[PDB]
Amino acid sequence: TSIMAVTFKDGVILGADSRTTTGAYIANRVTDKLTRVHDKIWCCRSGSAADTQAIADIVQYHLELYTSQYGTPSTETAASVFKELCYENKDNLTAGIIVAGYDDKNKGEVYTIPLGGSVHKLPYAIAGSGSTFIYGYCDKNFRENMSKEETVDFIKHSLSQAIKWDGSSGGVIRMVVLTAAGVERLIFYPDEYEQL
Amino acid sequence: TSIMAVTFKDGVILGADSRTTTGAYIANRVTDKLTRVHDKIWCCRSGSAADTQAIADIVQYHLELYTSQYGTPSTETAASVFKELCYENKDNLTAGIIVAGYDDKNKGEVYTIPLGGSVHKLPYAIAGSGSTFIYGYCDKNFRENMSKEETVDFIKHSLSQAIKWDGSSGGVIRMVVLTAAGVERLIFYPDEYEQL
Amino acid sequence: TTTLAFRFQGGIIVAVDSRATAGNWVASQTVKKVIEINPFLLGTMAGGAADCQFWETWLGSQCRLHELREKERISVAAASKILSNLVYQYKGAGLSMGTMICGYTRKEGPTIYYVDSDGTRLKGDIFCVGSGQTFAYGVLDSNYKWDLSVEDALYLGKRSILAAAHRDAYSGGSVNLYHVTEDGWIYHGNHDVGELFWKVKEEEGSFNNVIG
Amino acid sequence: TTIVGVKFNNGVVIAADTRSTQGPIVADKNCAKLHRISPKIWCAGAGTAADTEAVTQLIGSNIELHSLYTSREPRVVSALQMLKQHLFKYQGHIGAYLIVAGVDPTGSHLFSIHAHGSTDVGYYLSLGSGSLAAMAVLESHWKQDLTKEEAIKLASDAIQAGIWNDLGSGSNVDVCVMEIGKDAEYLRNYLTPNVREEKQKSYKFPRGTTAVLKESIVNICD
Amino acid sequence: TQQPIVTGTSVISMKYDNGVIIAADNLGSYGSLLRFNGVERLIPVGDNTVVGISGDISDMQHIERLLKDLVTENAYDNPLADAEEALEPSYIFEYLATVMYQRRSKMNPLWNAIIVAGVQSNGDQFLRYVNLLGVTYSSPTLATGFGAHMANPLLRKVVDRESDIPKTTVQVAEEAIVNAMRVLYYRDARSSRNFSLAIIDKNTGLTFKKNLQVENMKWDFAKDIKGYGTQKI
Amino acid sequence: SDPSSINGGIVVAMTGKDCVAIACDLRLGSQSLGVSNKFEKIFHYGHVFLGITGLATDVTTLNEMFRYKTNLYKLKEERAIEPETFTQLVSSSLYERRFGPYFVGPVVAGINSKSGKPFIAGFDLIGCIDEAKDFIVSGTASDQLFGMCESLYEPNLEPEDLFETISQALLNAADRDALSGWGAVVYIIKKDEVVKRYLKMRQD
Amino acid sequence: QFNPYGDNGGTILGIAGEDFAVLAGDTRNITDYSINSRYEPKVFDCGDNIVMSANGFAADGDALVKRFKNSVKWYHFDHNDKKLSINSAARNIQHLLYGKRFFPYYVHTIIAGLDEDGKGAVYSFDPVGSYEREQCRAGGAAASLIMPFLDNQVNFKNQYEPGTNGKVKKPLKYLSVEEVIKLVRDSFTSATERHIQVGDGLEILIVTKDGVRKEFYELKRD
Amino acid sequence: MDIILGIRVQDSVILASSKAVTRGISVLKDSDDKTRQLSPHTLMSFAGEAGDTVQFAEYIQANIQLYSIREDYELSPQAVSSFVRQELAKSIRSRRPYQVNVLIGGYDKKKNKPELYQIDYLGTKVELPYGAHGYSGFYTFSLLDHHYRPDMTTEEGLDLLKLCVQELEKRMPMDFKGVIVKIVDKDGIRQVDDFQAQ
Amino acid sequence: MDIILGIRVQDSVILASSKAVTRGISVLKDSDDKTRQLSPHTLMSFAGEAGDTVQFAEYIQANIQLYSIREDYELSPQAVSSFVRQELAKSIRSRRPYQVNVLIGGYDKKKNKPELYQIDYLGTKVELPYGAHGYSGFYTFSLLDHHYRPDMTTEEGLDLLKLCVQELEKRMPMDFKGVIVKIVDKDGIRQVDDFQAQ
């Protein structure tokens, strides 16, 4: 699994591969690891599919109820609910989650919640088995406030390298653009990103 | 440990960090992982220090004797002796070795001998715990037949990222240039490569 | 540890050693392995010191409540069952105790109950409990008769603990003696093995083995 | 155990503490952890004491024979190679961790060997449980081009770091100086900062205190 | 019962004549991967107390919230919240110590090594340690993990016994600390070059220096080291 | 489990003024079971004494080995072996079994016939030589012995005094060890004569 | 897996006089081969002339003392500041410990004070509460080194009247506070020489009808 | 385990050895003689692992007999026992060690004295007034520690055993099916055919 | 293990139970009665884990007695045994199960017939002519399989036991110290005080 979230000038973009596995078998090659917990607060799932789905499904429920009572929740708040669940249940979960959201006052924010249950706000974040192979690449290519075009490229390149080296990653590259303009889903096929 | 060997226009260059460890303790911060087995056939050692040293010490002995009887040995031959030792003793060794040599007819050659004892001839090779973090970076920056300057740079950048993410790597970056001109030792300190 | 209690024509004899060991380390040579439940009840200790010493003290409390409640001294059988049933509640938890509940009641006469943390409860005339038990049994079994002068029985008991203290590495220190009659128990001193051995050796001619 | 090695402008010096242990008990309050391989090649050892001694004498013996055979002064690289190949042959089962140094026809040298057979080379080294305490000192005070006295101070200071901060180290400081021109000078108990205070009382017993069962003379003459 | 995941390394500290100093690098490791770099492991509670934490970072973040909550709580119905009845280092410690022990006693520890540094209302210097087992102790110098093995030996050379405290100035002390941090950067494979340092002086108050860096390192001799024994070039 | 804790027993040596002393208990048991109270653990070859704690079978074996070796040594050297030399022989003999050692705790005591100097040394099970100038302890009650010695001991004691001191160290240490005791014996050694005494101690 | 227990070393000692008693302990606290503190008090005055020390695992040791001190505080509340006799304290400590019989306070505790007759008293407990009154007792890391000594010098064991053919044991006279302090110091300086977890300092608390008094002596720091 | 007892009286050594041979759930024999005569005045009793027991005894026997023929002489009991210890001592460090314990009772026609030697599978040898292998010790060692005298007659000795055997039939958990007794003295070795009621 | 035997003859049930009580290395008692009377015509013998054994027996006893008082009637042997099985069956899935095996011998005053019930700690109940718990079966089941008749007299039955007890003293490895016999019939329960030579 290869998942990342990059904050740029107009907001934030989430990216992921689409491969789910059980051993060496690809249980699903068109998986959607970019999950929606609110209008403009999404997450990237890595680790247990069962665990991350269950967690996401619950956060979504919490934010919906939160909205009913106190209006729109911040991206920070969403990261807080995830964290609360991942920390308090660290002994029975295997979920590496990235929370990305766009808000009118903060542009886009990115919170990475690793295996332990700690939270880390960052300019961008990478995770999943594939991420290890692109630590160098991403550190040498990320720039703050890139344009939507530059960001989509940075992600398409990073994930193609992750998909290239990590067997647990593959399929198509999926992206979700979160800006004031709305929500945009992007999809890139092998033939396109492989020869980058 | 972060070690790599890149073949370029005028020959080949070997690079390595200088950190040896025992747990979290840095037993040596000025280690020399670039070992000479012949005039223009050197190797990069990763894994067990005791094992790789013992292996290298033996190969050197074999090539010296080989020279006494049949003149200069090829780079291929040197990789062959290493491989023979690593394969036949795979059950009691933990040595990931890279063999790089310069010869007048082949420019520079690079043979990587991973844990199993298999041999792989390549344009360049990376290995050691730090190598995982620069798979993407190196795949997107290596070009065949670069100049000595470009190569030294490519290596200085790659290894700085390896040293950056992998705790088992650090210290100074050491290089050894093997060309028709001779043998050149290069050394780069933290202050220089850290801010690259 | 070595503890023994036996019934004979003159009542009951109770003898114990006084050594405490933590592994092969000798922690103490002055431990009281006999708990005085009351003027007519005695309890011996074998196994874990804390376990015995604690629960047997607790037993005394339970006996005292019984007497206030029922206006009468508790029977040896009942006292032993209080301990037996308590210990059974903890079966499997790790308690370690080989115990002897001895007493004299008008209704029961001289009585001895063996109770261990296994949940085993037995009434009998002779019982040797502890790592030195076999040694004590060796001496005791082959010199016991129902007709022993309260003074001869006392010595047989003392001598049996002596045997154990000698052979058993975990037994030693001194001997504590008790005699139990319907009038209650009578303490018959603490005999240090340091002096007792040599005395017995010289006077009896036994232990002829050891070099003197 | 704390053992170190420090190079100075014209030689090399090695030092060590003198505590020997078995669990939390001090076996020897003043053992010698400095071993002579050849007149001008000494080795400081940590790990299994019997092993540091045996392997050290074995190579030393072979170095002696080699020296007589070749009619040359022993070289540190030889002690180093013979030791490491031996330790390696024994897959680390010989618990020896050594700092080998000395001077020979090729100059002054400083290396270290680990039980499994790997070797290092440098200007300052430390091994043993006090390894970290000593290294902190060296990392804080070593500089290139030290005088014989500077080096001895540094080495001696590093050992103390061990003696005081490491429970596995203690007692005295043993030093050995090997200067490129002169004879090697072994300084047994160079420092003795741990003398036991005068006991509060004498426990000399009044004769006759101990009870004796029997007596006799033993014949030692044949 | 757990096992740490993201972790912080050493936390070193010592006390000088007027206050105490404490420092810790800004790394959050993930095994051998030096994953996170802007991790502050020095938590100021009020401005007479600074809590340095090492170990599992998720647990650290948790202990951080506990501390902020303590500050909020102490303020409730407390007209002397920033006077006679403000939090004292000793209170913050006793609380943390209590929590730490209860957690290990329930077989679910907060996987950390903690050092509380500060100045008591009466000017006294406070410096005590507590770890995931609930163990605690004080000394003129204190360090967790790797720093206990390398930093202490150095720091103790400055303040070896009680009578040395009054003879040590903030300059001398801060120097020792900064040098120890360098040494740790040399030999701890889980250390970072960036770190924070804080001073708690009974006169100057709380000085919290962020973004420091190990400077003046000796690496030049590395060029003269070739091979591992017999190699000459 | 621990082979050196099957039979039990202790040995201890001490240096006095122009004299050396070495004592031992007499117990030989099997775990808790006491079996023999006549198991001396001190031996001698010429004027060199050797005490051995540990597994009984090895104690016996080593004695028979050192007798063999010391006898041949005398036949070839035409002189009795000295303390220092013997210590070396003991050390190399043990290390020769480095990876399958005898489970013993050897102690050497004697006076160099040529220098008249007192000598004592201890060894771990693979030969590590500990040559002390004051005392050497060995056996299942070595901790107790260290405590006794470190306090009771003082330099240059006269034979008659050294005897009190060594006997008290041994006696009180053994009384705190379930595996030691059952009688002790003490050797006081001087250039000219050697005296052997059996102590009176608890038999529990 | 998670291990809820640790070992901080330490060694304590308790000796009873005719009208006084003493409880001593080194001031070194450790973890493996590192020293946590050269001075971390281990013997406490709990009031009503009771001194106590629960040696072993510090977390547990502190918890116990704390819990006992609190027990004393309530004893006063419930019985009009009535003094808690030493024997009563002992029975109470037993219940505190046995209360955790199945998840023990990994400590060996000793307390000292005066009995109801003004005589010196020492009580020692095992991890789960087994206890007994004694004249002297060592507990902790070097207990195995100190006890034999105390058996000899405090209760005159294995000592006979010279010339009595070893038939008359040396009588049980009784040590003065001065003679006791000497044995204490020698016990620790001796322990300090052979046990790597003993050193740095010795703190002694002396109990008399006039209260609790402290004395402190340094011990080798290696 | 099996009962192996030995007691050295005035002018002889007496060996008692349980007769039962049990395998798991069934007692297969009640007349087993756990002994081997090494020489006319030297008898050895044994107990231990199923196969090694006899294999070792017969092996020792063969050697002692061979020495006798070659030297036309009978080795002293002390010498015989020393040989046996050496053999077990070697065994303990061999690939597959003999799991055998033995008692050696012999009459030294030279010193004209009876001797009893106890030796376990580790090569531990000790000479005693009386000895035993296995659990038997735990009962008898204090019986004899009590009722034992150096000058006892062979008759007194046999009575002392009767005392021991009784205690063993009383407290031992197993039914060892009684013992077979044998006396070694100046005249050799003989069996007390009437002990099943002596 | 302990010997627990039961044989149902013509007009009665006979229960034999070893008298020894051994703990590790020592036999602590030779007169132990491993039985409990549940009602005037129902007897239960037991063997198993040290504590559970009696705790369970007395527990069952208390209940059967309580039922008797409340109903002023004596439950049939079949009913008593069914109650006991239910109790053990529950136990087998409890936190800490009773490790007890039992034989229930009773005389059904209504049907006027003797009955024998075998029940293990798992709650396995079977009615048989004769039964046994532990190893005893392995010897006796074929002895009785041979010499057994439905119409045998109480006297013949007791002789059949004597046959069994002998075989057990011959082949069983342990010394169970003989048995205590008891007969349940139309007149109740009585003990055969003279079997130690009957």
Ligand SMILES: */C1=C\C(=O)NCC/C=C/[C@H](NC(=O)[C@@H](NC(=O)N[C@H](C(=O)O)C(C)C)C(C)C)C(=O)N[C@H]1C(C)C
């Ligand atoms: C991202 C890959 C990872 O981050 N990690 C590798 C582990 C994969 C988890 C997930 N797939 C599954 O959970 C599948 N089930 C499974 O692996 N079961 C185990 C097994 O080995 O059979 C059992 C629990 C021992 C299945 C439910 C799809 C996966 O593919 N993770 C991806 C991404 C988050 C979907």
Ligand SMILES: */C1=C\C(=O)NCC/C=C/[C@H](NC(=O)[C@@H](NC(=O)N[C@H](C(=O)O)C(C)C)C(C)C)C(=O)N[C@H]1C(C)C
């Ligand atoms: C390159 C790092 C690696 O490739 N791999 C990590 C393992 C390190 C090996 C080598 N260091 C050592 O071997 C050190 N000894 C050691 O680790 N011993 C083990 C231990 O945990 O203590 C024993 C065998 C269980 C020491 C000999 C230096 C190392 O640092 N490798 C480097 C590079 C090749 C020097």
Ligand SMILES: */C1=C\C(=O)NCC/C=C/[C@H](NC(=O)[C@@H](NC(=O)N[C@H](C(=O)O)C(C)C)C(C)C)C(=O)N[C@H]1C(C)C
């Ligand atoms: C009788 C000897 C024996 O019957 N058995 C040998 C075991 C000895 C137990 C007792 N000594 C102790 O219990 C010691 N405390 C102890 O072991 N505590 C445990 C611990 O691990 O620390 C706790 C219970 C988990 C100590 C009090 C000496 C002993 O000596 N037994 C004697 C007799 C009954 C005193």
Ligand SMILES: */C1=C\C(=O)NCC/C=C/[C@H](NC(=O)[C@@H](NC(=O)N[C@H](C(=O)O)C(C)C)C(C)C)C(=O)N[C@H]1C(C)C
């Ligand atoms: C240096 C300290 C260390 O480097 N390491 C700590 C371990 C100590 C080793 C040595 N002492 C011993 O080796 C003792 N013998 C021993 O441990 N034997 C082993 C055993 O488990 O009994 C055998 C080999 C399996 C004893 C000889 C003191 C020690 O003190 N090391 C010092 C320094 C090198 C003397």
